[PDB]
Amino acid sequence: LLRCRLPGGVITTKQWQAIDKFAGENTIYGSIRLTNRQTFQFHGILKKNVKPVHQMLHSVGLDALATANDMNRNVLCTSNPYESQLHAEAYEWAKKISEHLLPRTEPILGQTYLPRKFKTTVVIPPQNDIDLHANDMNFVAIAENGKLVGFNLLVGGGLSIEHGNKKTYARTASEFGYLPLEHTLAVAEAVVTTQRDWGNRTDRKNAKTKYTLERVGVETFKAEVERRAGIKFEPIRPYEFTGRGDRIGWVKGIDDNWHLTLFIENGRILDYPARPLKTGLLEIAKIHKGDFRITANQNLIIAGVPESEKAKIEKIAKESGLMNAVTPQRENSMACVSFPTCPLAMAEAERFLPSFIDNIDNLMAKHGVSDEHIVMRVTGCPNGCGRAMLAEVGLVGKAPGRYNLHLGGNRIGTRIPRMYKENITEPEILASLDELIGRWAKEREAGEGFGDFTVRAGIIRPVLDPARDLWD
Ligand code: SRM
Ligand code: SF4
Ligand SMILES: O=S([O-])[O-]
Ligand code: NA
């Protein structure tokens, strides 16, 4: 397994052609796997190819630095903002934060480095596609007159739990305050160093920022950040989210620019019988004027297609099976890699999701809600890579063919789903949802999501303060 550092998921067509080649020739699986942190992975790299992989990345200006250690992981940035012009500067900031937090090999990270991996994002409301609540540090962009003026800082998100261990918990990020744009790096550095100093290093299961914040308190942590940064946080500026999904299909950008987001199931790029997904993308990379953007939903955006080139690109994407129409449900579902490559896997996730969604699609159809969607995620084990702990319906692997069923998150991802049923099989999971979806379809209010419904309808108690009420 090799994972690339790719701030904001922006990758050039030249870089793409290089990863496509290596993936095809030098890996056991021969696939490109887009991850939910806006970057990619190769699976099964032969030890002989370990050297040429870094050379290959480097030759195209890429690097795999801090992508799988107790450091700062890939920094995310909203991929396709409604106000298209805001992407450029938000992206430049994600890239700056990523570089600023990189190891000097350690003034920021320290010799011992960080107690645990640190995750950061740059968010452009109203989109929470990057799932800010799964991250340690988040910069929510505040714009005025089409220019960014600063960021609201949210700290402390993290989803990993350990089965039956009430000392572990998923936690959402807490608001600290607003900071003018110029204080960004000082603040970023301040949060990392405080966590580095205060983080429990002895017990790795308690090292994460979410635990540190709970131990010392948000205000205590906040004061130190201000002390260290040399600033005083201003009050949080208004922001709201409306969703977390990608904008599948064509959307108009700035000027005569267009963006085509392609839905890629499980982000698994390979040539399949009659669906040459991998070749189709290579063909588009060869004629595409612009970049590609890997989304936090494991999808790919062919960005900045001049209006004149739409038909060209669309022809290839269509013929390659990249534009095969799926239901809104499939578009809003996600799973982690899990087997066969993950050594920590308990239950299938990626290889289970397609057929599972085939079944969910039937149930949605049976209830007359086939145009609707429920943010549904499956994570192969409690480490939570599939981000099931921010889903409306989350399945958490517990053993081969058995999952813990969680309910009650919301569409925007600001609430953690409580465990509903434990250690059950697919047929048992489907039977529960069949009934639940039936009720939502008939009892819901106008535009009410499934998660909110289960909470309003008393089907599941909401998680109001994860550190204290996530576990029954
Ligand atoms: C590819 C990805 C899932 C996906 O299908 O997209 C993934 C895959 C793996 N994760 Fe992850 N994680 C991925 C997003 C996350 C997320 C979601 C997110 O960051 O948005 C989380 C939940 C949020 C959080 O961190 O709290 C997550 C929490 C973990 C953890 C538990 C961390 C913890 O704090 O306890 C581990 C295990 C560990 O570090 O001990 C882990 C471990 C792993 C490893 C590297 C397994 C290992 O330790 O050997 C998994 C590799 C599987 C494979 O064969 O590819 N992965 N993982 C994501 C790669 C992100 C990236 O490119 O950087
Ligand atoms: S959630 Fe568990 S099974 Fe899935 S990729 Fe992460 S570590 Fe592996
Ligand atoms: O190592 S997981 O966070 O990708
Ligand atoms: Na996808």
379 lines ligand 2 (CB under 6 A): yes
Phi, psi dihedral angles at 226 (to 5 degrees): -65, -40
Q: Do 354 and 319 belong together in one domain? A: no
Q: Do 225 and 286 belong together in one domain? A: no
Q: Do 50 and 143 belong together in one domain? A: no
The domain spanning residue 27 has which CATH number?
3.90.480.10
Q: Which residues contact 379 (CB under 8 A, 6 or more apart)?
A: 335, 336, 349, 385, 386, 387, 388, 389, 394, 395, 396, 397
Domain boundary (224, 242, 260) is at 242
Domain boundary (192, 225, 242) is at 242
Q: Do 332 and 312 belong together in one domain? A: no
Ligand 3 atom with the smallest distance to the CA of 35 is: 4
Q: Do 232 and 286 belong together in one domain? A: no
Alpha-carbon distance 295 to 293, whole Å?
6
132 lines ligand 2 (CB under 6 A): no
Split into its structural domains, the chain has a count of 3
Tokens at residue 455, please? 């909470």
Alpha-carbon distance 123 to 81, whole Å?
9
344 lines ligand 3 (CB under 6 A): no
Phi, psi dihedral angles at 176 (to 5 degrees): -105, -45
Q: Do 335 and 465 belong together in one domain? A: yes
Question: Which ligand has an atom closest to residue 3 CA?
Answer: 1
| 160 Cα: distance to centroid of ligand 3 (angstroms) | 10
Structure letter (DSSP) for residue 135? S
To which H or E segment does residue 434 belong? helix 426-443
The DSSP code sequence of 296-336 is TTS-EEEEEEEGGGHHHHHHHHHHTTTT----HHHHTEEE-
Q: Do 218 and 193 belong together in one domain? A: yes
How big is the CA angle at 266 (ends 37 and 13), to the nearest 5 degrees?
A: 65
Closest among 264, 437, 463 to 367, alpha carbons compared: 437
Crossing angle of the two packed helices 13-26 and 50-59, in degrees rounded to 10: 170
Alpha-carbon distance 26 to 352, whole Å?
26
Q: Ligand 1 pocket: which of 29, 128, 383, 416 to mutate (most atoms <8 Å of CB)?
A: 383
How big is the CA angle at 93 (ends 160 and 264), to the nearest 5 degrees?
A: 55
Q: Which domain holds residue 365?
A: 327-469
- Measured in whole angstroms, the distance separating CA 323 from the mean position of its chain's CA atoms is 22
Residue 206: CB atoms within 10 A of its CB come to: 18
The domain spanning residue 180 has which CATH number?
3.30.413.10
Resolution in A: 1.9
Q: Ligand 2 pocket: which of 266, 298, 344 to mutate (most atoms <8 Å of CB)?
A: 344
For residue 269, the number of C-alpha atoms closer than 13 Å in the C-beta half-sphere is 28
Domain boundary (274, 292, 326) is at 326
68 lines ligand 2 (CB under 6 A): no
Active site residues: 3, 73, 117, 119, 336, 342, 381, 385
Q: Do 217 and 353 belong together in one domain? A: no
381 is in an annotated binding site: yes
- Cα→Cα distances 283→40, 44, 136, 270, 315, Å: 19, 25, 38, 13, 11
Peptide bond preceding 238: is omega within 30 degrees of 0, i.e. cis? Answer: no
- The residues pairing with 33 across neighbouring beta strands, listed in sequence order, are 41, 268
Alpha-carbon distance 22 to 58, whole Å?
13
| 358 Cα: distance to centroid of ligand 2 (angstroms) | 22
To which H or E segment does residue 191 belong? helix 184-198
Q: Do 85 and 178 belong together in one domain? A: yes
Tokens at residue 326, please? 């799926």
Q: Do 96 and 187 belong together in one domain? A: yes
28 lines ligand 3 (CB under 6 A): no
| 68 Cα: distance to centroid of ligand 3 (angstroms) | 6
4 is in an annotated binding site: no
What experimental approach yielded this model? Answer: X-ray
Alpha-carbon distance 59 to 57, whole Å?
6
Structure letter (DSSP) for residue 127? B
Q: Do 423 and 462 belong together in one domain? A: yes
| 34 Cα: distance to centroid of ligand 4 (angstroms) | 8
Crossing angle of the two packed helices 184-198 and 209-216, in degrees rounded to 10: 80
Q: Do 390 and 316 belong together in one domain? A: no
